[PDB]
């Protein structure tokens, strides 16, 4: 996995470039997916220049005459099975090349060697050939390249015409060639011996290797591509393709001419994201622009409103963002035009990219700084690429442009500043709109009648509205969602309940939004779409709004500006139309929209303003979906905009789905009327109305940003009309016809059900005599409302059965709960066997069945210590497993009690916050667990209120007492699957006996993610559902996010069985498990272990108050008080009895069905049947996609291996074979070794042995020391304990000092290095992630996210990058240089010192929660002096030395940064 | 893959319901892959059945006619999107076809349905 590019600066071809590319490719085998075969790869490739002399000598030998101009050679993949496809494709190519007039020299068969390819990579091997075409018309290179591109496109279209399969063109150009395939990285020069020739010299080279998630290779899917190479994964492709489908209908350029016609469907079929991006990039380059300009236009910089850039770049970025939609996502790009060679990064800068210049005029860049061996006395400058940066090389003139120089040189081509001034805002338009035209308020009775027509209750106004108007933030709930799903419910559930939101597992990182909110934009532009292949002042003349949501006054002002060009359309249908009124209304509106747009209209306002007693309102979602889809399909969406006036928008989940469907702006007027009516009654106090409206809009925008950030999209323009939702319970026809791209794995109600529901509610509201709104139960139970899962009768009966310890009571409980009408998916299925029953005494004992149950994780921050300890003791008594969850654990509980009760936990979690993760915390468990996303709040981090943190929790988490602690949504260690494999390797090295468990959340596409994580040596997968509890999270994330585990579990099982991977991993599920029937159904689906969770809390005393976030739970389960903790009534015997009953129920059911063990029922899906609720509901749920049976073959249907999946050994092994005197006599040692980038986690296993022998703090500092010479790998010294000293001479790649636990790391350049130690990067990204103790001294600059989540470490580094010291918690950090933008964001504890010569810190710092001043206390001066003295002592630096020399005049150049919450708690005050 | 199945199901269901007939549901045919060789198994497709009933009360003659027209339209629409390995072995109210790439004598073992009474 990785990209790389080598370039000769002067611009002269030479062989060293090519071979060095090969050498760099030969050393990326550690990041790839290891396979037991040793021959099967997953894609590799190189991209070089054309060796003219080679092919010219070939032609000369053949018998022709070598021409004077350059040659053109095209590499093609033809089919291999039959002999017609080859001949047909050859005929097509030759007829299509000769139609222009060029001369064909002949075909050539590339020599290959199939001895190295595996099997599955050989069954689809295509026939590789080359065609040699020469230019005889004497045209220029420019026109020649143009016709070659046009010929390639025409050949592709013509071949696709005849539906010929497995045909591909890897290149057709006169400048560059591409050698790619499905082999291993190191075996590239063996499969293609041509590259071993002496005449293959070039002036640039790009190389790439990928890491696929499945095990079915397709040769045309290997990178690099033609004028592109991509590392990472793009988020927004379902929306960018849809917008390209509208951009195509107006674009044209005179360079192409009539031939423009065959490039209309630019993004074909059968491509990935890296293919569509490449196609768009190539089209935009071939029309006049240059590679830097296209890279800026597609992947722009983050437009931030600070004074740290010249206004030229701001105007340029404004133009670029105005002309095109960005292509977000983690992306490290290495692209090449015919002249330029560019290496660039995305907006957030997630992937790493490091480069190096040598004295030979040679630049080498890639993912790792140790790929190409280079003598240290040959370097000139080392560097990196920050967020949005780029580095370019011009081969024509032979020059090297860095970031700022390239920006300056690019900002002078066109007068951007004079062009951007054409933009018109609405803020000025609403300011100048005089305060007239105030409309009279609606009557109370009319408001109530309209609110009743949509099903709005008073709990929608007192619970989820009032906090918005008062606080400016959003509502909060604290328990799982036990509400029935939308289709099975019986009340009026709005259409916006059928759409679940989306998020990102390991393959993509979610974007946290409370800290780097500066890179997220909500800009909206009307009058924007047009020709994307132009450059003029008319392209930047439009209307710009700062938020897609508009109030009523802003809507009236914008309607003023629109005026005499807009067209309004009603969205109401007659109630008495008949059985097909809704469909006819849809038809009518989608015809009138097209007939009005063709008439010159430019703005469409879709409103339901005419709703009355005889006209029902069409659901706004359906209306805007139909209209947007029709406008896209008729090549008219490019002409107009789409404004919606709705009467149901009250929650932040409505606006999300409306903007996701395709609407431009959304106006919600009924909510504003309700706000005004509630204000006139004197309910908010003394605040004005405009302040309330501003607070409401701010809360809406914050919630919209939260919803947009769960997936990784940072701009609204690329999220609109992409539809990243998922419908559960809608008919396949309806979704596939009216909505752009959503999957409905089970069909649901069509149009008749929607019409019936709408008409029923309308009749109830407009014919019945309303006096007040119903109370309504959706978040809390009310007798008039809906049904729920956990309620009074069942809870009391369960507590009685568990307390009295009698089984018949528990059967009464199960009988009550298994008799309600269906509420979940697993209620419709039915067990049905064909064998004869067997007696009860013959099935497995309760012991071996109870050992299959575990308890999910519940942090100590949420639960009380007594309940946590009770669970840990109860689960260890029966031999099962418990869980500690996030928030760490008490060390003093690490020994068995003398009651015998073991308070330890057998499963430890590694959250994304790393709040208590140390070296001892990971060596005191049997089985580990990685938590990627939680069931209740997917794509989000756990929360903990500011008053829940006492001394005990603050000491247990190494944080500040009385401070809100919010975990980061992303992981900062897991940005892609290769990083997940790296982290799994780390975890398996630090603990040599435990297993690694990955926890996902059920959704669509989880099958490929599961097949990918199984190749990363993970051995247990956990699938949670949307029905899980939580400690504290917003209500929208609880009710409108996730999916039932019935879908995800079956999907993962089928996908894992299909890839021959099921026999290596285990499956575990939880969420909503209550009885034995549920457990038997889950075991039939494919699971092997089961988690219980909430039910256990009910056995201990919880009574479902749903006030866990208030710290006032009555019984005393989740509360951090003392007066309330004294009311606990839990005891382990209750939990033991619950588990015993639950297991013996499974025994009952198994004996009644006809089997004798759970191993004989797992996977046997054919024992389940589907029966529907009857002929009076007509929901067409077909669970057959859920009951499909994939045949395993020879393997079993469960895990059949012993122990964990094994891993190779790094250098540490040799160390353990050398430092035996240290472990047996306990004496000092000293070792020296040579490091290389193919060696990961150096010094971790040794730390494990030291921890097991002496402990974390048993050895004096510097007991064992190692001296590495070379380039260190990744995760160098991760989880190192005190007593170990690593000294690296060279550099470290990434994650150096991750989770330091008291050790000591020192990085310095070579003594013979001619480099300025304060101007060259020496360590990469994410340094000191979640460290608690130790020291780290570096003699260079660090990467991005330097010292994130630091807790006790001390670091001295000569530089930093962007987002440094983000969300730090404790320790000291000295930075002797410049910092990056958004420095010290979310910092809440510790201290920092910056050495400021530029006097430019107040421009970069995030002055939100920290204060910055100058040193005024000698006590804080001795600290800095001693730190710099220790730095000089260890690294022998020269910068810090001369800083220490001139101390009296440089002490006044330091800024001291201290958190705001550390102002009352420091030991001596910072002031005078 | 799991898209081609879903895409083809969506196409079939949108194209049958455009005429007005009622879909009763899908059914997965029971098979036994123990008898098939290797090269005859790497290209084995997913076999399914769709049950449609006539509710408009039309005659058999018009019913067969619309069934043929629906089959042709489904074929064209699926070919539109260049989806590979999609086939319809029969769609009629009169006859059914059980065929495959197995030996002649092993037909009743791969398809146990024909062993019914
Ligand atoms: C009070 C509470 C705290 C929780 N804390 C965590 C946690 O810290 N980490 C985590 O991964 N899941 C946490 N969970 C979710 C559980 O791990 C599990 O997914 C959930 O309880 C399953 O729901 P169920 O009991 O209905 O089956 C918590 C759940 C609750 C109710
Ligand atoms: S709902 Fe929460 S407040 Fe206590 S009683 Fe149950 S843990």
* Three-state SS sequence of A612-623: ECCEEECCHHHH
If you ran DSSP here, which 8-state letter would residue A684 be given?
S
**CA A1323 to CA A1304: how far, in whole Å?**
15
Helices A807-817 & A792-804, crossing angle to 10 degrees? 160
Tell me the nearest-neighbour CA distance from B11 into chain A, angstroms.
8
Q: Which of helix, strand or coil describes residue A543?
A: strand
Per the CB < 8 A criterion, the answer to whether A637 and A602 are in contact is no
Dihedral Cα A464, A465, A466, A467, nearest 10 deg:
60
Q: Which of B13, B33, B84 sits opposite A733 (nearest CB)?
A: B13
Q: Does B2 touch chain A (CB under 8 A)?
A: yes
Ligand 1 atom closest to residue A1093's alpha carbon, by position in its atom list: 25
Q: Is A1057 on the interface with B (CB under 8 A)?
A: no
- Token readout for B24 is 């009763």
Contacts B9 to A, Cβ<8 Å: 732
Q: Is there a contact between A747 and B25 if contact means CB atoms under 8 Å apart?
A: no
Q: Check whether residue A464 and residue A484 sit in a common domain.
A: yes
The C-alpha angle A634, A639, A645, rounded to 5 degrees, equals 95
In units of Å, what resolution does this entry have? 3.5
Active-site amino acid positions of A: 1
Q: Which two tokens stand for residue A1136?
A: 């033991």
- Closest-CA residue of A relative to B8 is A732
Tokens of A13: 């071809």
Q: Give the CA distances from residue A1085 to residues A140, A1161, A1197, A1388, in Å, rounded to whole numbers and listed in that order.
A: 65, 9, 11, 46
Whether chain B has a CB inside 8 Å of the CB on A1007: the answer is yes
Structure tokens at A286: 């071939």
- My answer on whether A28 and A42 are in the same domain is yes
Q: Are strands A1372-1375 and A1391-1395 parallel, antiparallel or unpaired?
A: parallel
Q: Is A446 left (phi over 0), alpha (psi -120 to 50) or beta?
A: alpha
Q: Is the dihedral of CA A34, A38, A43, A46 positive or negative?
A: positive
Q: After which residues is chain B broken (C to N over 2.5 A)?
A: none
E-strand ranges in A528-617 read: 543-545, 549-550, 566-570, 572-574, 603-607, 615-617
Are A756 and A821 in a shared domain? no
By the 10 Å C-beta count (0-12 exposed, 13-18 middle, 19+ buried), A181 is classed as: buried
Whether B82 and A1182 lie within 8 Å, measured CB to CB: no
Dihedral angle of Cα A612, A614, A620, A625, to the nearest 10 degrees: -150
Identify whether residues A185 and A326 lie together within a single domain. yes
Vertex A1221: Cα angle to A1219 and A1224 (nearest 5): 115
Pairing of strands A71-78, A168-173: antiparallel
- The sign of the torsion formed by the CA atoms of A594, A596, A600, A606 equals negative
Cα separation values, A1117 from A779, A1130, A1131, Å: 21, 9, 12
> How many angstroms separate the Cα of A1425 from the Cα of each of A1347, A1368, A1375, A1396?
21, 22, 13, 16
Would an 8 Å CB–CB cutoff place A1191 in contact with chain B?
A: yes
Same domain, residue pair A255 and A362: yes
- C-alpha A1309/C-alpha A383 separation (Å) is 14
- Burial (CB < 10 A; 0-12, 13-18, 19+), residue A345, is buried
Rounded CA gap, A660 and A650, in Å?
Answer: 17
As a whole number of angstroms, the distance between CA A1309 and CA A1289 comes to 6
- Cα dihedral value A1419, A1425, A1427, A1429, nearest 10: -150
Tell me, yes or no, whether A447 and A399 share the same domain. Answer: no
Q: H or E segment at A205?
A: strand A204-209
Three-class SS state of A1349: coil
- Residue A313 structure tokens: 């770049």
Q: Which chain B positions have a beta carbon within 8 Å of A747's beta carbon?
A: 13
Within this chain, do residues A1029 and A1064 fall inside the same structural domain, yes or no?
A: yes
Distance CA A870, CA A1005 (A): 38
Distance CA(A219)–CA(A76), nearest Å, equals 12
Q: Is A446 on the interface with B (CB under 8 A)?
A: no
- At a CB cut-off of 8 Å and minimum separation 6, what does A923 contact? A990, A991, A1248, A1251, A1252
The number of angstroms, rounded, from the C-alpha of A99 to the middle of its chain's C-alpha atoms is 48
Burial environment of residue A54 by CB neighbours within 10 A (0 to 12, 13 to 18, 19 or more): middle
| Alpha-carbon gap, residue A1296 to A988, rounded angstroms | 17
Task: Find out whether A921 and A888 touch, Cβ atoms under 8 Å.
Answer: yes
- Residue A483 DSSP class: P
A1172 lies in the same domain as A1238: no
Edge-to-edge strands, sheet with A997-1001: A853-854, A1089-1091, A1066-1070, A1020-1024, A997-1001, A927-931, A907-910
Whether residue A1109 is annotated as binding a ligand: the answer is no
Please check whether residue A657 is in contact with residue A499, taking contact to mean a CB–CB distance below 8 angstroms.
Answer: yes
Closest to A1273 in 3D by CA, of A375, A371, A378: A371
B4 burial level (CB within 10 Å; 0-12, 13-18, 19+): middle
How close is the Cα of A1291 to the center of ligand 1, in Å? 42
Q: Which residue in B20, B78, B95 sits closest to A583, CA to CA?
A: B20
Nearest ligand, measured from the Cα of A941: 1
Residue-level length of chain A: 1472
**For residue A109, which of A154, A88, A155, A78 has the smallest C-alpha distance?**
A78
Domain of A1290: which CATH number?
2.160.20.60
Question: Separation of A852 CA from ligand 1 center, angstroms?
Answer: 18
Report d(CA B59, CA A665) in Å as an integer: 52
* Cα angle: A995, vertex A1001, A1005; to 5 degrees: 105
Closest chain B residue by Cα to residue A120: B42
Same-domain check for residues A140 and A282: yes
Q: How far is CA A1094 from CA A9, A259, A1027, B63, in A?
A: 64, 65, 10, 55
As a whole number of Å, the end-to-end CA separation of chain B is 36
**How many CB atoms are closer than 10 A to CB A865?**
16
**What's the total number of domains in chain A?**
4
* Distance (Å, whole) CA A179 – CA A192: 8
Strands A1264-1271 and A1284-1291: parallel
Q: Classify the phi-psi angles of A1282: left when phi > 0, otherwise alpha if psi is within -120 to 50, otherwise beta.
A: beta
Method underlying the structure: cryo-EM
| Domain encompassing residue A1095 | 781-1203
Distance (Å, whole) CA A28 – CA A30: 6
Domain boundary among A398, A422, A446: A422
Burial label, A1221 (beta-carbon count in 10 A; 0-12, 13-18, 19+): exposed
Give bridge partners of residue A73 from the DSSP assignment.
Answer: A132, A173
Minimum CA distance residue for ligand 1 atom 12: A857
Domain shared by A1147 and A1212, yes or no: no
Distance CA A1394, CA A1415 (A): 11
Sheet holding A524-526, edge to edge: A424-425, A543-545, A524-526
Sorted by sequence, the CB contacts under 8 Å of residue A717 that are 6+ apart come out as A321, A325, A326, A523, A524, A525
Partner residue facing B26 (CB), from A123, A163, A1184: A1184
In degrees and rounded to multiples of 5, residue A1050 shows phi and psi of -65, -40
**Final residue of a domain: which of A422, A457, A472?**
A422
Strand A1410-1414 and strand A168-173: the pairing is unpaired
CATH value at residue A746: 3.20.20.70
Rounded Cα–Cα distance for residues A268 and A1240 (Å): 41
Same domain, A1074 and A1145: yes
End-to-end CA distance of chain A: 55
CA dist A698 and A243 (Å) reads 28
For residues A1067 and A1013, give the distance between their C-alpha atoms in angstroms, rounded to a whole number.
13
Of the candidates A836, A957, A901, the residue with the CA atom closest to the CA atom of residue A1369: A957
- The span from the CA of A620 to the CA of A495, in Å, is 9
- The backbone region for A522, taken as left when phi is positive above 0, alpha when psi lies in -120 to 50, beta otherwise, is alpha
- Tell me how crowded residue A428 is: count the other CB atoms within 10 A of its CB: 10
Which contiguous run of DSSP H or E holds residue A242? helix A240-247
Give yes or no: residues A1167 and A1251 share one domain: no
Distance CA(A904)–CA(A873), nearest Å, equals 7
Helices (H) and strands (E) in chain A, counts: 42, 47
The residue among B5, B16, B21, B25 with the most chain A CBs within 10 A of its CB, best to mutate, is B25
Q: What is the distance between the alpha carbons of residues A1017 and A85, in angstroms, rounded to a whole number?
A: 41
Report residue A1455: phi and psi, to 5°.
-100, 135
Q: In the listed set A364, A398, A422, which residue is the last one of a domain according to the structure?
A: A422
> What does the alpha-carbon distance between residue A172 and residue A74 come to, in Å, rounded to a whole number?
4
């Amino acid at each position: 996995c990785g990209v790389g590019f080598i370039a000769a600066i002067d611009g002269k071809p030479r062989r060293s470039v090519v071979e060095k590319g090969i050498e760099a490719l030969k050393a990326v085998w550690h990041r790839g997916a290891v396979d037991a075969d040793g021959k099967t790869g997953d894609g590799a490739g190189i991209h070089v220049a054309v060796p003219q002399k080679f092919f010219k000598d070939h032609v000369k030998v053949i018998g022709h005459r070598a021409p004077d101009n350059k040659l053109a050679v095209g590499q093609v993949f033809l089919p291999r099975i039959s002999l017609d496809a080859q001949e047909a494709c050859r005929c097509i190519v030759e007829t299509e090349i000769l139609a222009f007039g060029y001369y064909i020299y002949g075909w050539r068969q590339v020599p290959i060697n199939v001895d190295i390819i595996g099997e599955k990579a050989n069954a689809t091997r295509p026939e590789i050939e080359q065609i040699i075409v020469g230019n005889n018309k004497g045209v220029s290179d420019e026109q020649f390249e143009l016709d070659l591109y046009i010929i390639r496109r025409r050949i592709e279209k013509a071949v696709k015409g005849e539906q010929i399969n497995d045909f591909y063109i890897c290149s057709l150009s006169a400048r560059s060639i591409i050698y790619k395939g499905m082999f291993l990285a190191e075996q590239l020069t063996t499969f293609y011996p041509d590259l071993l020739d002496e005449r293959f010299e070039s002036d640039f080279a790009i190389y790439h290797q990928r890491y696929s998630t499945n095990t079915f290779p397709t040769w045309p899917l290997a990178q690099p591509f033609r004028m592109l190479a991509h590392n990472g994964e793009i988020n927004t492709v379902k929306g960018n393709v849809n917008w390209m489908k509208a951009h195509e209908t107006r674009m044209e350029h005179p360079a192409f001419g009539t031939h423009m016609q065959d490039l209309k469907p630019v993004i074909g079929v059968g491509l990935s994201d890296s293919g569509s991006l490449d196609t768009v990039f190539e089209v935009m380059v071939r029309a006049g622009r240059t590679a830097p300009m296209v890279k800026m236009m597609l992947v722009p910089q983050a437009l931030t409103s600070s004074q740290t850039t010249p206004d030229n770049h701001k105007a340029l970025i404004q133009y670029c963002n105005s002309v095109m939609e960005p292509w977000d996502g983690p992306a490290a790009l290495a692209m090449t035009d015919g002249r330029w060679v560019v290496g660039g990064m995305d907006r957030n800068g997630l992937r790493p990219m490091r480069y190096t210049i040598t004295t030979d005029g040679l630049i080498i860049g890639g993912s790792e700084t140790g790929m190409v061996k280079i003598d240290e006395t040959q370097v000139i400058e080392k560097g990196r690429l920050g967020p949005g940066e780029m580095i370019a090389v011009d081969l024509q003139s032979g020059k090297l442009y860095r970031d700022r120089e390239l920006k300056d040189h690019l900002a002078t081509l066109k007068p951007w500043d004079k062009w951007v001034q054409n933009t018109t805002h609405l803020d000025e338009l609403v300011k100048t709109a005089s305060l007239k035209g105030e409309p009279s308020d609606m009557d109370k009775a009319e408001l109530r009648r309209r609110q009743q027509a949509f099903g709005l209750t008073m709990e929608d106004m007192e619970l989820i509205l009032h906090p918005m108007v008062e606080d400016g933030k959003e509502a909060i709930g604290s328990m799982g969602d036990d509400s029935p799903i939308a289709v099975l419910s019986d009340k009026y559930r709005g259409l916006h309940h059928f759409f679940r939101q989306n998020f990102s597992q390991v393959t993509n990182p979610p974007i946290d939004s409370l800290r780097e909110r500066r890179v997220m934009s909500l800009k909206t532009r009307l009058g924007n779409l047009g020709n994307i292949l132009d450059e003029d002042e008319t392209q930047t003349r439009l209307l710009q709004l700062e938020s897609p949501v508009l109030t009523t006054a802003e809507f009236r002002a914008m309607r003023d500006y629109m005026g005499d060009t807009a067209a309004e359309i009603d969205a109401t249908f007659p109630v008495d139309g008949g059985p097909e009124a809704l469909r006819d209304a849809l038809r009518r509106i989608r015809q009138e929209t097209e007939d009005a747009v063709r008439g010159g209209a430019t703005h469409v306002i879709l409103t339901d303003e005419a709703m009355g007693p005889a006209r029902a309102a069409i659901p706004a979602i359906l209306a805007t979906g139909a209209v947007h889809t029709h406008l896209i399909r008729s090549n008219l969406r490019t002409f107009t905009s789409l404004n919606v006036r709705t009467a149901e928008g009250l929650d932040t989940h409505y606006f999300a789905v409306l903007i996701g469907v395709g609407a431009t702006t959304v106006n919600a007027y009924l909510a504003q009327e309700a706000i005004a009516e509630r204000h006139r009654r004197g309910l908010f106090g003394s605040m004005p109305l405009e302040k309330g409206m501003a607070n409401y809009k701010k809360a809406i925008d914050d919630g919209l940003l939260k919803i947009m950030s769960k997936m990784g999209i940072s701009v609204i323009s690329s999220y609109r009309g992409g539809g990243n939702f998922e419908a559960i319970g809608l008919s396949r026809a309806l979704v596939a016809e009216h909505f752009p791209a959503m999957v409905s794995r089970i069909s649901g109600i069509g149009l008749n059900g929607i019409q019936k529901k709408v008409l029923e509610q309308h009749a109830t509201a407009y014919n019945e005599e309303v006096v007040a709104l119903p109370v309504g139960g959706f978040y809390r139970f009310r007798k008039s409302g809906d049904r729920h899962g956990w309620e009074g009768g069942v809870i009391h009966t369960l507590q009685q059965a568990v307390t009295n310890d009698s089984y018949t009571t528990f059967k009464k409980y199960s009988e009550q709960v298994n008799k309600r009408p269906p509420m979940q998916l697993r209620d419709l299925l039915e067990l049905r066997s064909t064998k004869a029953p067997v007696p009860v005494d013959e099935v497995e004992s309760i012991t071996a069945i109870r050992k299959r149950f575990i308890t999910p994780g519940m942090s100590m921050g949420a639960l009380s210590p007594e309940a946590h300890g009770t669970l840990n003791v109860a689960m260890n008594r029966i031999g099962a497993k418990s869980d500690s969850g996030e928030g760490g654990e008490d060390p003093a509980r690490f020994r068995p009690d003398k009651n015998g009760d073991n308070w330890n936990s057998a499963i430890k979690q590694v959250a994304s916050g790393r709040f208590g993760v140390t070296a001892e915390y990971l060596n005191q468990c049997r089985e580990l667990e990685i938590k990627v996303a939680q069931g209740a709040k997917p794509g989000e981090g756990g929360q903990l209120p500011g008053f829940k943190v006492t001394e005990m929790i603050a000491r247990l988490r190494h944080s500040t007492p009385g401070v809100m602690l919010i975990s980061p949504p992303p992981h900062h260690d897991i940005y892609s699957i290769e990083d997940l494999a790296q982290l799994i390797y780390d975890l398996k090295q630090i603990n040599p006996d435990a297993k690694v468990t990955v926890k996902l959340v059920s959704r669509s596409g989880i099958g490929t993610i599961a097949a990918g994580v199984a190749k990363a040596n993970a051995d247990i997968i956990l699938i949670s559902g949307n029905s899980g509890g939580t400690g504290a999270s917003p209500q929208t994330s609880i009710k409108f996010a996730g999916l039932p585990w019935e879908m995800g579990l079956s999907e993962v099982h089928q996908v894992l069985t299909l890839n021959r991977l099921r026999h290596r991993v285990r499956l575990r599920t939880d969420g909503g498990l209550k009885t034995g029937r549920d457990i038997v159904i889950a075991a039939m689906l494919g699971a092997e272990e089961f988690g219980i969770g909430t039910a256990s809390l009910i056995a201990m005393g919880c009574i479902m108050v749903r006030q866990c976030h208030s710290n006032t739970c009555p019984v005393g389960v989740c509360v951090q008080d003392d007066k309330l903790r004294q009311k606990f009534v839990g005891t382990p015997e209750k939990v033991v009895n619950l588990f015993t009953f639950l297991a013996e129920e499974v025994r009952e059911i198994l004996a009644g069905l006809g089997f004798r063990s759970l191993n004989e029922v797992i996977g046997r899906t054919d024992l389940l049947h589907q029966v529907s609720r009857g002929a009076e509901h007509l929901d067409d749920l077909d669970l057959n996609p859920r009951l499909a049976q994939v045949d395993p073959g020879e393997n079993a249907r469960y895990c059949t291996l012993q122990g964990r999946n094994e891993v190779p050994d790094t250098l540490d092994a040799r160390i353990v074979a050398d430092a035996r005197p240290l472990f047996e006599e306990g004496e000092k040692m000293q070792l020296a070794y040579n490091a290389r980038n193919t060696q990961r986690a150096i010094g971790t296993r040794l730390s494990s042995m030291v921890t097991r022998k002496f402990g974390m703090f048993g050895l004096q500092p510097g007991h064992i020391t190692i001296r590495l010479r070379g380039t260190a790998g990744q995760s160098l010294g991760a989880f190192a304990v005190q007593g170990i000293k690593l000294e690296v001479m060279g550099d470290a790649n990434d994650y150096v000092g991750k989770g330091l636990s008291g050790g000591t790391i020192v990085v310095r350049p070579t003594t013979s290095s001619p480099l300025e130690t304060n101007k060259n990067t020496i360590i990469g990204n994410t340094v000191l992630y979640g460290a608690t103790a130790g020291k780290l001294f570096a003699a260079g600059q660090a990467g991005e996210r330097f010292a994130v989540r630091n807790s006790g470490a001390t670091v001295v580094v000569e530089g930093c990058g962007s987002n440094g010291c983000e969300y730090m918690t404790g320790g000291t950090a000295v930075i002797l240089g410049r910092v990056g933008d958004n420095f010290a964001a979310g910092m809440t504890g510790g201290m920092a010192y910056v050495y400021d010569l530029d006097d430019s810190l107040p421009l970069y710092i995030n002055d939100e929660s920290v204060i910055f001043q100058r040193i005024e206390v000698g006590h804080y001066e001795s600290q800095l002096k001693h730190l710099i003295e220790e730095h000089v002592t260890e690294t022998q630096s020269r910068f810090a030395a001369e800083i220490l020399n001139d101390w009296a005049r440089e002490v006044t150049k330091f800024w001291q940064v201290v958190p705001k919450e550390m102002l009352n708690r420091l030991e001596v005050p910072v002031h005078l």
